[PDB]
């Protein structure tokens, strides 16, 4: 009995993978799946065999929840006065006494459970390693290639998987080659593959440099950030502490040697090494290289950067798929816009001096006063609504009638915004065909349109439950009204 359990727990081979705690948790699960067969009532039975102290004791988990099905494990939130349960959750009991013990089929079940758990413990150890050793590039020989993933080995039963997005779109894969990658994820209690290696994630390139460039690793060239389109293009912004270091000529090597070497190691991936700057504007300027920009409009609130390249290099500035921008949009994490080609491509002198259509009636006491003022900007129209008098004194012509007209126009704007709010709040529009229906007055029509229908044809296609939660009516008058509607719409045969 319990002595046999003690013998078999002291006789397990993988005591490092399956210590006594996990062994008796296995036995808990085995007794649970055994009691699943002992009684027709599918129940959970923790048994806490107390491996060190004694033998098993079948417990009946109250399994606190409002339902009743399988009532051996059904208790509501307060049925805890008896026996001193006194708890809304966690209170458990032992109703089953002298349950079935160790039939041969249950022995076979415990056997298969313990062998699959030895496997699962090997998996748990290798994934603890997977999680701790999240580090440098690792070599491995592949075993199987598929359309969605490939499988790799290192030796000593070190299985790993490289997913489709982790590979390259054109890197030919066949079972038997030594491929190198970077361990990236952590998955403690997975079911399929254990280790996860990638060759396409951005930081991979970082570590590439960290093992290639002799400068990085001693923290003289602090790599700032990087973005990557898998197997296509890797942009990377770096920052140096020393002043006599030239990362434009040191990180790449001698006429494209280090960058070219790490590109061949990547499997044919272009790389753009850029110098990181503490200014996001200058950073997004230099990141889109090779490209020149003379129109920089950076707004911090909406996270945008109007970075317009001069006309002519467009086909090279954006590139295929917008890579040179996308990676930039992934380097800083901002948004970029370029649409202008010839019509005032400055995008900063244009919008500042193109308002001849909206500023037609602003100082409409007499148009012969002065033109509009671009010193304040006159370009947001809403933060402009309330400005202090600390700058409302430089321009000439601000007589008292001017501020009186300002107040009148403020009243007009308040009235128009109130009208707009009334129009946008009344998404009901009760037409005459809705008020003319007998028994449906103005508030009833408002609510009927708030239900979701604003016409007459669809009204006849709703039940009593669709009119439930009615305010002003009740299910019998509901049925009366829906019958009148289906008569005037369907049973009337009129149009």
């Amino acid at each position: 009995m319990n002595k046999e359990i003690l013998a078999v727990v002291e006789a397990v081979s993988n005591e490092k993978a399956l210590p006594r705690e996990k062994i008796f948790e296995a036995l808990e699960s085995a007794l649970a799946t055994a009691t699943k067969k002992k009684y027709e009532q599918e129940i959970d039975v923790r048994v806490q065999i107390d491996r060190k102290s004694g033998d098993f004791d079948t417990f009946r988990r109250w399994l606190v929840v409002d339902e009743v099905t399988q009532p051996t494990k059904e208790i509501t939130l307060e049925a805890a006065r008896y026996e001193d349960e006194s708890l809304n959750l966690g209170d458990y009991v032992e109703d089953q006494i002298e349950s079935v013990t160790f039939d041969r089929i249950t022995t076979q079940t415990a056997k298969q459970v313990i062998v699959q758990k030895v496997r699962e413990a090997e998996r748990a150890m290798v994934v603890d390693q997977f999680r701790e050793h999240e580090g440098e590039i690792i070599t491995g020989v592949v075993k199987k290639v598929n359309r969605d993933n490939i499988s790799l080995d290192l030796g000593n039963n070190a299985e790993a998987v490289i997913l489709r997005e982790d590979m390259l779109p054109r890197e030919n894969f066949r079972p038997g080659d030594r491929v190198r990658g970077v361990l990236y994820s952590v998955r403690p209690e997975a079911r399929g593959a254990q280790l996860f290696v990638t060759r396409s994630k951005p930081e991979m390139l970082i570590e590439l440099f960290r093992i290639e460039v002799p400068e990085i690793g001693e923290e003289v060239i602090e790599i700032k950030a990087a973005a990557r389109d898998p197997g296509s293009r890797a942009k990377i912004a770096v920052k140096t502490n020393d002043k006599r270091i030239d990362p434009v000529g040191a990180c790449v090597g001698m006429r494209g040697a280090r960058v070219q070497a790490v590109s061949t190691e990547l499997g044919g991936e272009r790389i753009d090494i850029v110098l990181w700057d503490d200014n996001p504007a200058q950073f997004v300027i230099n990141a889109m290289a090779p490209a020149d920009v003379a129109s920089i409009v950076v707004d911090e609130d909406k996270h945008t950067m109007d970075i317009a390249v001069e006309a002519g290099n467009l086909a090279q500035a954006i590139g295929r798929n917008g890579q040179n921008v996308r990676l930039a949009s992934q380097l800083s994490g901002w948004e970029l816009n370029v649409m202008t080609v010839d019509d005032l491509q400055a995008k900063h002198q244009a919008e500042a001096h193109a308002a001849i259509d909206t500023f037609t009636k602003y100082l409409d006491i007499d148009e012969d006063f002065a033109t509009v003022l671009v010193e304040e900007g006159f370009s947001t129209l809403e933060e402009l609504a309330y400005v202090p008098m600390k700058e409302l004194l430089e321009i000439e012509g601000l007589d008292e009638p001017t501020v009186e007209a300002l107040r009148e126009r403020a009243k007009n704007a308040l009235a128009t915004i109130a009208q707009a709010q009334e129009e946008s709040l009344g998404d009901n529009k009760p037409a005459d065909d809705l008020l003319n229906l007998e028994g449906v007055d103005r508030d009833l029509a408002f609510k009927l349109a708030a239900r979701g229908v604003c016409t007459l044809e669809d009204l006849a296609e709703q039940g009593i439950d669709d009119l439930a939660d009615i305010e002003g009516l009740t299910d019998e008058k509901a049925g009366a009204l829906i019958m009148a509607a289906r008569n005037i719409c369907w049973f009337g045969d009129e149009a």
């Binding site: 107390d50 102290s53 026996e83 001193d84 006494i97």
Partner: protein, 417 residues
């Protein structure tokens, strides 16, 4: 109804009570079973019970409430407590949990505690608003506790002897080194009676280890407070059980800012019991002890400390020597340097019927200035100096003579001058 209100009553009285309650004559079952059946009948009558018990946790998770007269042992009168209360209040070992209880149905064995009412004579919020024992700052003995009775009796001798040799304070760790036949048990009785009659403000709790049943009866109804004993009718397992009971109870009561005095006799017996209960580690040292078999006794003797923020824990423990064996000698070696208070009882003066037989030479007190004031220390020092002329036997003569002519400390001091 309650436990002690029935347990401090004799067995014949409980039998008559159970027969008066209309029950199967209970003179056939033990007293614990008598009270168990009486409580079961009272709960059958249509009401709840109000019980009290000191708390014990094993590796299982729920709690056992042991009673006082049971010497904190396993029995049917021990109350069951669901682990939910332990998860709620984190009630460690050493709570006299007082609360409402219900009778057990079939499939159960003990009464179940419904709700908490009293946590060590305090509000259950103290169960959630308190400080643990391992975190406070242990200090030296600050308060001075007088030992002399004050009647001029013939056993007052012993007390006043100690008072003029080495007084006792709150938070002290006293170890008495004495060979067999030196007057140990009546010394325990004398000092306990004096501390409980002179200072009822302080709380007493006496521990007896490996004594005779008549000694247990003479100890239990003679001194105040709880008298916990563990004789030979229980194995070393139940010995360590009651020992850990009383130590965690004292720890929790001290955490509750209470003064707890623990008399213990002897230490070698509990050390042998522990050696009996701890398995071997492949090696045997001098005397036949283990490596970790000393860790339990060490902890047990060193749990004493003075709590300057509230409450205190003092222990007065006797040791066995001159037993012919080695293990007792090495145990005395290990425990003579760990205590902050050492006293010795001689056997040569004891066998001459000259009591008490104090070793005025090897007697000492750790940092006695915190236990003795200005001219108080002056008097004590000059008397130590004048007794210093090498003497054991006629030194005991001088002490006992000048102590028998006189009644208090100041009388002796002002008549010797």
């Amino acid at each position: 109804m309650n436990l002690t209100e029935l347990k401090n009553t004799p067995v014949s009285e409980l039998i008559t009570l159970g027969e008066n309650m209309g029950l199967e004559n209970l003179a056939r079952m033990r007293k614990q079973d008598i009270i168990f059946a009486i409580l079961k009948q009272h709960a059958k009558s249509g009401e709840d019970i109000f019980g009290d018990g000191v708390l014990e946790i094993l590796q299982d998770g729920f709690g056992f409430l042991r009673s006082a007269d049971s010497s904190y042992l396993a029995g049917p009168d021990d109350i069951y407590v669901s682990p939910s209360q332990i998860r709620r209040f984190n009630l460690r070992t050493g709570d006299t949990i007082s609360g409402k209880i219900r009778p057990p149905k079939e499939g159960e064995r003990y009464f179940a505690l419904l709700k908490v009412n009293e946590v060590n004579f305090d509000k259950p919020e103290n169960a959630r608003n308190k400080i643990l024992f391992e975190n406070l700052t242990p200090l030296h003995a600050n308060s001075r506790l007088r030992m002399e009775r004050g009647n001029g009796s013939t056993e007052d001798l012993t007390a006043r002897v100690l008072d003029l040799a080495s007084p006792i304070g709150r938070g002290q760790r006293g170890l008495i080194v004495a060979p067999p036949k030196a007057g140990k048990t009546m010394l325990l009785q004398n000092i306990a009676q004096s501390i409980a009659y002179n200072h009822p403000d302080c709380v007493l709790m006496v521990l007896l280890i490996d004594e005779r049943p008549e000694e247990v009866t003479e100890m239990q109804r003679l001194v105040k407070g709880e008298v916990v004993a563990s004789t030979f009718d229980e194995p070393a397992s139940r010995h360590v059980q009651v020992a850990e009971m009383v130590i965690e109870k004292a720890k929790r009561l001290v955490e509750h800012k209470k003064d707890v005095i623990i008399l213990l006799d002897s230490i070698t017996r509990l050390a042998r019991a522990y050696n009996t209960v701890v398995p071997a580690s492949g090696k045997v040292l001098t005397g036949g002890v283990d490596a970790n078999a000393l860790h339990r006794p060490k902890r047990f003797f060193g749990a004493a400390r003075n709590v300057e923020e509230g409450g205190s824990l003092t222990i007065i423990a006797t040791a066995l020597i001159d037993t012919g064996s080695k293990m007792d000698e090495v145990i005395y070696e290990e425990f003579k340097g760990t205590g902050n208070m050492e006293l010795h009882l001689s056997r040569k003066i004891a066998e001459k019927r000259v009591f008490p037989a104090i070793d005025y030479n090897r007697s000492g007190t750790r940092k006695e200035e915190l236990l003795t004031t200005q001219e108080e220390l002056q008097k004590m020092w000059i008397l130590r100096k004048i007794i210093h002329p090498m003497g054991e036997i006629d030194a005991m003569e001088f002490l006992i003579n000048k102590l028998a002519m006189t009644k208090t400390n100041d009388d002796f001091f002002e008549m010797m001058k």
